[PDB]
Design an enzyme around this catalytic site. Structure first.
Site, PDB file in Angstrom:
ATOM      1  N   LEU A 135     -11.592  10.937  -9.422  1.00 48.71           N
ATOM      2  CA  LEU A 135     -10.632  11.693  -9.726  1.00 48.71           C
ATOM      3  C   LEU A 135      -9.198  11.207 -10.073  1.00 48.71           C
ATOM      4  O   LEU A 135      -8.689  10.406  -9.177  1.00 48.71           O
ATOM      5  CB  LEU A 135     -10.369  12.893  -8.569  1.00 48.71           C
ATOM      6  CG  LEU A 135      -9.883  14.180  -8.879  1.00 48.71           C
ATOM      7  CD1 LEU A 135      -9.883  14.887 -10.149  1.00 48.71           C
ATOM      8  CD2 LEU A 135     -10.437  15.254  -7.887  1.00 48.71           C
ATOM      9  N   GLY A 155      -8.488   8.498 -11.827  1.00 46.04           N
ATOM     10  CA  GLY A 155      -8.509   7.278 -11.529  1.00 46.04           C
ATOM     11  C   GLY A 155      -9.174   6.924 -10.077  1.00 46.04           C
ATOM     12  O   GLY A 155      -8.848   7.486  -9.200  1.00 46.04           O
ATOM     13  N   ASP A 176      -6.487   6.410  -2.913  1.00 47.03           N
ATOM     14  CA  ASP A 176      -7.760   7.215  -2.699  1.00 47.03           C
ATOM     15  C   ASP A 176      -8.353   6.229  -1.629  1.00 47.03           C
ATOM     16  O   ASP A 176      -9.525   6.439  -1.211  1.00 47.03           O
ATOM     17  CB  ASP A 176      -8.558   6.955  -3.824  1.00 47.03           C
ATOM     18  CG  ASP A 176      -8.243   7.530  -5.174  1.00 47.03           C
ATOM     19  OD1 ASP A 176      -7.359   8.152  -5.221  1.00 47.03           O
ATOM     20  OD2 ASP A 176      -8.832   6.997  -6.303  1.00 47.03           O
ATOM     21  N   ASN A 225      -2.853 -11.291  12.504  1.00 46.69           N
ATOM     22  CA  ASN A 225      -4.185 -10.928  12.981  1.00 46.69           C
ATOM     23  C   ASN A 225      -4.563  -9.335  12.622  1.00 46.69           C
ATOM     24  O   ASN A 225      -3.726  -8.560  12.846  1.00 46.69           O
ATOM     25  CB  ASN A 225      -4.117 -10.968  14.761  1.00 46.69           C
ATOM     26  CG  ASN A 225      -5.214 -10.706  15.426  1.00 46.69           C
ATOM     27  OD1 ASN A 225      -6.085 -10.278  14.892  1.00 46.69           O
ATOM     28  ND2 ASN A 225      -5.295 -10.759  16.703  1.00 46.69           N
ATOM     29  N   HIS A 276     -12.772 -15.860  14.304  1.00 38.62           N
ATOM     30  CA  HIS A 276     -11.942 -14.391  14.370  1.00 38.62           C
ATOM     31  C   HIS A 276     -11.218 -14.499  12.886  1.00 38.62           C
ATOM     32  O   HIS A 276     -10.309 -15.707  12.899  1.00 38.62           O
ATOM     33  CB  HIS A 276     -11.030 -13.990  15.498  1.00 38.62           C
ATOM     34  CG  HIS A 276     -10.224 -12.900  15.668  1.00 38.62           C
ATOM     35  ND1 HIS A 276     -10.941 -11.749  16.234  1.00 38.62           N
ATOM     36  CD2 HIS A 276      -9.120 -12.691  14.901  1.00 38.62           C
ATOM     37  CE1 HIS A 276      -9.780 -10.693  15.909  1.00 38.62           C
ATOM     38  NE2 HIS A 276      -8.752 -11.281  15.096  1.00 38.62           N
ATOM     39  N   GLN A 314      -7.435   5.094   5.590  1.00 38.82           N
ATOM     40  CA  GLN A 314      -8.163   4.908   6.682  1.00 38.82           C
ATOM     41  C   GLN A 314      -8.845   5.863   7.538  1.00 38.82           C
ATOM     42  O   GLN A 314      -8.036   6.849   7.585  1.00 38.82           O
ATOM     43  CB  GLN A 314      -7.460   3.734   7.530  1.00 38.82           C
ATOM     44  CG  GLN A 314      -6.122   4.403   8.319  1.00 38.82           C
ATOM     45  CD  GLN A 314      -5.459   3.502   8.765  1.00 38.82           C
ATOM     46  OE1 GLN A 314      -4.273   3.102   8.256  1.00 38.82           O
ATOM     47  NE2 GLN A 314      -5.601   3.080  10.189  1.00 38.82           N
ATOM     48  N   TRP A 351      -7.279  -7.476  13.255  1.00 42.20           N
ATOM     49  CA  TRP A 351      -8.122  -6.784  14.305  1.00 42.20           C
ATOM     50  C   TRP A 351      -7.777  -7.215  15.427  1.00 42.20           C
ATOM     51  O   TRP A 351      -8.176  -8.061  16.344  1.00 42.20           O
ATOM     52  CB  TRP A 351      -9.977  -7.475  13.849  1.00 42.20           C
ATOM     53  CG  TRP A 351     -10.789  -6.594  14.779  1.00 42.20           C
ATOM     54  CD1 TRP A 351     -10.550  -5.147  15.126  1.00 42.20           C
ATOM     55  CD2 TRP A 351     -11.932  -7.127  15.302  1.00 42.20           C
ATOM     56  NE1 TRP A 351     -11.673  -4.682  15.857  1.00 42.20           N
ATOM     57  CE2 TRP A 351     -12.571  -5.723  16.039  1.00 42.20           C
ATOM     58  CE3 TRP A 351     -12.630  -8.181  15.310  1.00 42.20           C
ATOM     59  CZ2 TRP A 351     -13.777  -5.797  16.583  1.00 42.20           C
ATOM     60  CZ3 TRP A 351     -13.947  -8.279  15.997  1.00 42.20           C
ATOM     61  CH2 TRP A 351     -14.484  -7.192  16.761  1.00 42.20           C
ATOM     62  N   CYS A 367      -8.863  -1.757   8.260  1.00 51.64           N
ATOM     63  CA  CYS A 367      -9.491  -2.851   8.478  1.00 51.64           C
ATOM     64  C   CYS A 367      -8.945  -3.922   7.234  1.00 51.64           C
ATOM     65  O   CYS A 367      -8.590  -3.218   6.064  1.00 51.64           O
ATOM     66  CB  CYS A 367     -10.953  -2.585   7.849  1.00 51.64           C
ATOM     67  SG  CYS A 367     -11.697  -1.563   9.426  1.00 51.64           S
TER      68      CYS A 367
END
Ligand code: CA
Ligand code: CA
Length: 308
Positions: free
Chosen positions: A52, A54, A59, A249, A225, A62, A251, A68
């Site tokens: 929709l 583009g 769009d 960091n 990690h 999260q 996460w 993430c």
């Protein structure tokens, strides 16, 4: 084949159900829940649209899986609309020809793998719980994330992932990798140029075995990690030129606790402006500075992913 399954369903008047990745708990976690129910887009909104106005950065909102680092890669994919058209085939829509089935393409090692899905999504009050557009009628990003969760085996398998690895899956490119303790003499300038250019940069500490996976060190770093490199600079500290590097960091929010950490005396020592020049503030945000020499001693690898 995708075209064949769509055709089968369409000639049989039914909506596709993916036996390989079904609408059930195993597709979400390997342990868990919060009150969700699986629904197709046409059953949560009246006129579901695939793309929709583009396929763009607005769009990408999260959901309960988190902000993430993987989201950064999808964001960068929308800036490469040619690459976006390979990952997301445009032969597809909720209009005439719709049969509850979509597909996406991910580069795997020497091949674009077609990954097929049904459009059932985890849902709360008729609203998407995981990735979603700001336009609640738009479903491509929600569906992209389901297809990537499937390649990876589950939604839960996605947290902790590298944006670099995803960008490789999205483009067919390969990040360059450097060993910190066997690095070129101009390693600083290489990193500096990559950052100025707009590249994605990641850094890791090697695990000597599965035992070391997510092991925390006494310096507040985590082995095996994924981290992101976000800045590189120089300061005048007690009459010397010190090279610094900024690490995020992505996460959790565990941070480095040695020299140049958030509350360290180095920051108090350095000239009044220079703290603002480097935009430093002490926050539990997962982001921090280290001396570039400490960086090379404590990290093992750097990955630079140049976006054309
Ligand atoms: Ca859009
Ligand atoms: Ca911080």
């Amino acid at each position: 084949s995708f075209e064949q399954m769509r055709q089968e369903c369409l000639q049989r008047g039914t909506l596709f159900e993916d036996a390989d990745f079904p609408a059930s708990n195993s597709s979400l976690f390997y342990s868990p829940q919060i009150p969700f129910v699986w629904k197709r887009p046409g059953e949560i909104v009246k006129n579901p649209e695939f793309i929709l106005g583009g396929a763009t950065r607005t769009d990408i909102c999260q959901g309960e899986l988190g902000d993430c680092w993987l989201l950064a890669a999808i964001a960068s994919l929308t800036l490469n609309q040619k690459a976006l058209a390979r990952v997301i085939p445009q032969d597809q829509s909720f209009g005439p020809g719709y049969a509850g089935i979509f597909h996406f393409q991910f580069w795997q090692h020497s091949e674009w793998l077609d990954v097929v899905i049904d459009d059932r999504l985890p849902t709360f009050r008729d609203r998407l719980v995981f990735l979603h557009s700001a336009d609640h009628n738009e479903f491509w990003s929600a569906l992209l994330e389901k297809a990537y969760a499937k390649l990876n085996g589950s939604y839960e398998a996605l947290k902790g992932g590298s944006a670099i690895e995803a960008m490789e899956d999205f483009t067919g490119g390969v990040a360059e990798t450097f060993q910190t303790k066997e690095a070129p003499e101009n390693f600083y300038e290489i990193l500096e140029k990559a950052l100025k250019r707009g590249s994605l940069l990641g850094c890791f500490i090697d695990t000597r075995s599965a035992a070391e996976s997510e092991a925390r060190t006494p310096f507040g770093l985590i082995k095996g990690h994924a981290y992101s490199v976000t800045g590189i600079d120089q300061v005048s500290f007690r009459g010397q030129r010190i090279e610094l590097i900024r690490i995020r960091n992505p996460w959790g929010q565990v941070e480095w606790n040695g020299s140049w950490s958030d509350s360290s005396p180095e920051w108090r020592s350095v000239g009044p402006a220079e703290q603002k020049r480097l935009c430093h503030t002490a926050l539990d945000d997962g982001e921090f500075w280290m001396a570039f020499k400490d960086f090379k001693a404590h990290f093992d690898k750097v990955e630079i992913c140049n976006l054309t």
